[PDB]
């Protein structure tokens, strides 16, 4: 059995989210198919050599990633589809049996047979039972879950004859994301995929997580005869053939019209033409060069390893404590060696303010802060807004005096039902008579009075002196300003030390020789995380380099000198002549050795290794690196596209182009030298 390979132009597009958008180009990093890749071309033959002998190309294809299963059927060739995990009756199964008025999905662990045939011939008066024949199964077990979906997830139109359908699958643990559509080609050419753009929308999702490692195709026999030329052959000789693809986690681009339809699709890791469309949110690239990324991408799973801690932070003992204190001796309690869970905080009260100066509350959940302090106090209602960076000293800002560079939140809420009393309201006080402005995070517990110039007041107020710590009077007979408000000012600290307070993120495994996403102890990187031999201090983390780019970070659990080298060469420019002129790009390398590309060593579209090639696309060495994709001529022109080191690029036809002659030249890429005249 010999199989061929066919390419895809622009098909296999799928909506990533489940919402509608209008004039919004969203960029996401998920799993989707790649055009211009090889697809298997299993040619299915329908023949019979006996009553029990059936010949059909039913091979156990291995879906390391999800694959496209086309539906190029005439009437009823493909009706179902099998999915196995081990083919040994050890994992849950799934069947998409979408037949006439019967769309029952069975997910029972069964070991039926090795080859599954399908016919539409009633065995013995099968009009009373279901239309699905009982020759598919051989036993029965405990039924876990079933589906009684009424709508048919199968497009069948026996009038057109051609079936250019697109179907994809998603093997996620959350849902299945079954996307099925159907189109029709206007030309009766061979069984090839037509060119053009197309998108798929989800129809039915399955919340059952099943480990899928083996895939099998299902075909309907529909022979009913043994000799060619009958009412089922010759006139309807429609032995079909289907293709299978594979997924690779890359970055995709999608556009949404005013109605919500996708027009085009751009993959960053296909050609240097499309690399400029991802780094810059645009589809009409201008003439010149741009700074983009190489063909490398991110893998399926990321690494988010955090320090080994299993203790919960005592945030409950902070917010809903029994009794608070006046703001001259605010209760500041540090939190360390625990796991931060910023979810029980919202379960306390309808907070009037949640101003998080510094770290945004979105990323505040997972950053692995060094230490966390919890300052709790009761301030006046209309004076809560003064507890913030800035806010020049008011009558209450001389007690806390938040600094100008704060990296925490300010949670506050009214407590009139726990603090206000008819008589007992003098327990809460505030400092009013101060000498100088306090320092950030500095308390000034004191009972000495302020001398009023004339005579030194020695513990007695008398004529003009006044005792400090005046009462607030938080009685339940005021408005919304003169009410007690319990404020919890969480302050996060980030110093060079092993982190002790992290978010609720699990710890993954270590994958060295792979370009996985770097998320160690809050640091975000996208380089090669492998073993190195750098020199680090014993208790020092988050190492840096001569530049501000993070070069190495020690693992939080098992100390390890692991450096972060970039997955791309970085200095890989892209010469774009414009999406409205041509589609030729000369790749520029900024001071690098011979082309390696560790990720795409032998990709489909490889610009180097084109020494013996005509009409442009040649390799040359420059002072700023290597020039691949153009030619060199001893002529000179203006600054059309600057390459560097006195060399520039220009998109001209050729040096020999006469409009009155019969010799018409191409429009390849040619590079010239710069002249001063």
């Amino acid at each position: 059995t010999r199989t061929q390979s066919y390419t895809n132009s622009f098909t296999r597009g799928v909506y990533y989210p489940d919402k509608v958008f209008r004039s919004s180009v969203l960029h996401s990093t998920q799993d989707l198919f790649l055009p211009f890749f090889s697809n298997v071309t299993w040619f299915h033959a329908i023949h019979v050599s006996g009553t029990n002998g059936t010949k059909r190309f039913d091979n156990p294809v291995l879906p390391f990633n999800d694959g496209v299963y086309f539906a190029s059927t005439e009437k009823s060739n493909i009706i179902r589809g099998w999915i196995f995990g081990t083919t040994l009756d050890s994992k849950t199964q799934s069947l998409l049996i979408v037949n006439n008025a019967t769309n029952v999905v069975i997910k029972v662990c069964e070991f039926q047979f090795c080859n599954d045939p399908f016919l539409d011939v009633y065995q013995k008066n099968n009009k009373s039972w279901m239309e699905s024949e009982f020759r598919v199964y051989s036993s029965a077990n405990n039924c876990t879950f079933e589906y009684v979906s009424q709508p048919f997830l199968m497009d069948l139109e026996g009038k057109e004859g051609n079936f250019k359908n697109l179907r994809e699958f998603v093997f996620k643990n959350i849902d299945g994301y079954f996307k099925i559509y159907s189109k029709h080609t206007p030309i009766n050419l061979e069984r090839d995929l037509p060119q053009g753009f197309s998108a798929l929308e989800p129809l039915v999702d399955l919340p059952i997580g099943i480990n899928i490692t083996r895939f099998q195709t299902l075909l309907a026999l529909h022979r009913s005869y043994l000799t060619p030329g009958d009412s089922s052959s010759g006139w309807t000789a429609g032995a079909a053939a289907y293709y299978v693809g594979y997924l690779q986690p890359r970055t995709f681009l999608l556009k949404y019209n005013e109605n919500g339809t996708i027009t085009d699709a751009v993959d960053c890791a296909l050609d240097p033409l499309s690399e400029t469309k991802c780094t810059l949110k645009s589809f009409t690239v201008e003439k010149g060069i741009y700074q983009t990324s190489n063909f490398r991408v991110q893998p399926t799973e990321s690494i988010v390893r955090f320090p080994n801690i299993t203790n919960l932070c005592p945030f409950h003992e902070v917010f809903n404590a029994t009794t608070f204190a006046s703001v001259y001796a605010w209760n500041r309690k540090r939190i360390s060696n625990c796991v931060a869970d910023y979810s029980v905080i919202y379960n306390f009260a309808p907070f009037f303010a949640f101003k998080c100066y510094g770290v945004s509350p979105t990323k505040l959940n997972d950053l692995c802060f060094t230490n966390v302090y919890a300052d709790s106090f009761v301030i006046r209602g209309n004076e809560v807004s003064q507890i913030a960076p800035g806010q020049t000293g008011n009558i209450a800002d001389y007690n806390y005096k938040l600094p100008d560079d704060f990296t925490g939140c300010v949670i506050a809420w009214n407590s009139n039902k726990l603090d206000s009393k008819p008589s007992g309201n003098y327990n809460y006080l505030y400092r009013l008579f101060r000498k100088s402005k306090l320092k950030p995070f500095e308390r000034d517990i004191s009972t000495e009075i302020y001398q009023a110039g004339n005579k030194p007041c020695n513990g007695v107020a008398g004529s003009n002196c006044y005792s400090p710590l005046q009462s607030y009077g938080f009685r339940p007979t005021y408005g919304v300003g003169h009410q007690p408000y319990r404020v919890v000012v969480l302050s996060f600290e980030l110093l060079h030390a092993p982190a002790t307070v992290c978010g609720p993120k699990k710890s993954t495994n270590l994958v060295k020789n792979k370009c996985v996403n770097f998320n160690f102890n809050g640091l975000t990187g996208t380089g090669v995380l492998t073993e190195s031999n750098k020199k680090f201090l014993p208790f020092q983390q988050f190492g840096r380099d001569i530049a501000d780019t993070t070069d190495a970070v020690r693992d939080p659990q098992t100390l390890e000198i692991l450096d972060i080298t970039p997955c791309s060469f970085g200095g890989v420019s892209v010469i774009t002549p414009g999406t409205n002129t041509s589609n030729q790009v000369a790749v520029l390398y900024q001071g690098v050795n011979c082309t390696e590309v560790p990720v795409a060593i032998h990709a489909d579209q490889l610009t180097p290794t084109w020494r013996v090639y005509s009409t442009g696309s040649n390799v040359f060495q420059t002072r700023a690196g290597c020039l691949i994709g153009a030619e060199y001529v001893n002529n000179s022109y203006e600054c059309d596209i600057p390459i560097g080191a006195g060399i520039c690029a220009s998109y001209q036809t050729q040096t020999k182009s006469h409009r009155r002659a019969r010799s018409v030249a191409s429009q390849s890429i040619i590079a010239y030298t710069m002249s001063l005249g």
Partner: antibody
Amino acid sequence: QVQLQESGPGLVKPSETLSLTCTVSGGSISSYYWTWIRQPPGKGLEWIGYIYYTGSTNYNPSLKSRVTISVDTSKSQFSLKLSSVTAADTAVYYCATDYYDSSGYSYGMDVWGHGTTVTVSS
Amino acid sequence: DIQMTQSPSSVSASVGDRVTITCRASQGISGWLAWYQQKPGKAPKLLIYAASTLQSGVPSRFSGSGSGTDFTLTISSLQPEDFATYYCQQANNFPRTFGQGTKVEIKR
């Protein structure tokens, strides 16, 4: 949830050395000033000093040049080498966790140990 | 070196009374004091640090106050589970000294 388990001798001859071990279980050694504190029987509490993770020692002027506190960052341990032990050094030594924050706070002894009596006799 | 001195060496009272233990010093500590407790023979467990701020798991019966040189500790209700020797720890400079112990007794 940090704990401190003490371990050391119980009877030390005079003029010899004195060293015990407090293993840290509950967190890494990068926050507290894991050190010791002595308490003679029937008297008050006397301090020893504080040792940080970045090798920073500071003792009391009384017993300054008789103690050399060390820390083992590898196996998360720290010991107190007390030399020239005399009869006055009979005390119940405890392991405590002190910390003063950079802003200016002075959090007291949060986590304590259990106590290991060190009798000086022969 | 600051020498912490506690005036009441033994405050004998009954269940329901208020005990006021004082702690004076030579040099003036701004606001950083501490109160400990070790009833049978165990290690002194902290109750109120910074002389006003309670610790996680400390009953509301304990309450500290004072500033400068004079600091006090006010136990509202004398629960049977309060017999211990309370201490005062100066926490301003590097050498942290303690008090002299206050054997709080209960008169049944």
